[PDB]
Amino acid sequence: SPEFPGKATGKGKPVNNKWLNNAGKDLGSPVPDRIANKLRDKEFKSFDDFRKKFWEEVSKDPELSKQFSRNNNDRMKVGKAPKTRTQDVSGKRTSFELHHEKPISQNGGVYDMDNISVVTPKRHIDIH
Ligand SMILES: [Cl-]
Numbered sequence: 803s804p805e806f807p808g809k810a811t812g813k814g815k816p817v818n819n820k821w822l823n824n825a826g827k828d829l830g831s832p833v834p835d836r837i838a839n840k841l842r843d844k845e846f847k848s849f850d851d852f853r854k855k856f857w858e859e860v861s862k863d864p865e866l867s868k869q870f871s872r873n874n875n876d877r878m879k880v881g882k883a884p885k886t887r888t889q890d891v892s893g894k895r896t897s898f899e900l901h902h903e904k905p906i907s908q909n910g911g912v913y914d915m916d917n918i919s920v921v922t923p924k925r926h927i928d929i930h
């Protein structure tokens with residue numbers, strides 16, 4: 803179902819300068835409220851379309867962008883996830899991933915930003 807369109811909803815959460823520090827534990831990091839404000843009520847053709855726009859908006863956020871290296875900003879500018887610490891990769895999965903907290907399977911919203919978290923590839927697996 804992430805291969806089909808819909809409209810982003812949700813509020814996201816307040817975040818600070820240590821956004822993504824805990825993406826490798828628990829249920830990961832929330833969608834920042836500031837980013838949710840940019841994406842809410844917009845239409846997306848696919849979840850990949852959403853993910854690209856999500857990271858693009860991160861790169862344009864003055865608070866979030868300064869938490870990342872120039873190359874990671876360059877990735878996010880074109881919709882690519884920033885790279886994780888080396889210790890948090892799994893195989894060829896080397897950049898942060900988006901996770902649905904209530905699974906798509908159980909009617910968790912695909913584009914519900916209050917159902918989406920940011921996780922390391924390593925942590926993502928464990929939740930699955
Ligand atoms: Cl809502």
Ligand SMILES: [Zn+2]
Pocket residue numbers: 900901902926929930
């Ligand atoms: Zn997941």
